[PDB]
Amino acid sequence: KETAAAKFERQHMDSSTSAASSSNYCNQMMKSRNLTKDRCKPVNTFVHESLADVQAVCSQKNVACKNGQTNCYQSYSTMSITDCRETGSSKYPNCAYKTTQANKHIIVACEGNPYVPVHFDASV
């Protein structure tokens, strides 16, 4: 029922803040966006740019995806992101995350008609 595009929006878009809210940000967002349901998702990135800006990346620099597919695109501009990485002390269901804020180029996989982000591949 949830499209691939909607799932990318749920897992990776947070336009509501310019940067990471706090040291707390990942613990809160990873649960609220339902990334801690069946396991602790080990690593996840949120993008603090408009949806339009992130969708636009599908028309930007074509690059190889990490899995070898060709449908990945790197932003020409840096973007505000937050990396969430599970701690070594993290035990499901109390999933614990290190929140790291950065400004980096993002790489997304795009699919569909219309052609939209469906997977967050990397930042660089």
The CATH number of the domain holding residue 98 is: 3.10.130.10
Beta bridge mates, 79 = 104
**Structure-token match 């878009």, residue found:** 13
Q: How many structural domains compose the chain?
A: 1
The amino acid occupying position 10 is R
Q: Can 105 be counted among the known catalytic residues?
A: no
Single out the catalytic residue among 5, 8, 11, 12: 12
- Provide the residue range defining the domain that includes 98: 2-124
Q: Any alpha helices (H) in 2-68, and if so which ranges? A: 4-12, 25-32, 51-55
* Cα–Cα distance list, 24 to 21, 28, 80 (Å): 7, 6, 17
PDB experimental method: X-ray
Distance CA 51, CA 73 (A): 15
Reduce the DSSP state of residue 103 to 3 states and report it.
strand
* Cα–Cα distance list, 39 to 3, 19, 33, 44, 104 (Å): 21, 26, 13, 13, 27
The answer to whether 45 touches 12, Cβ cutoff 8 Å, is yes
Single out the catalytic residue among 119, 120, 121, 123: 119
Instruction: Tally Cβ neighbours within 10 Å of residue 19.
Output: 14
27 is in an annotated binding site: no
Name the resolution in angstroms.
Answer: 1.7
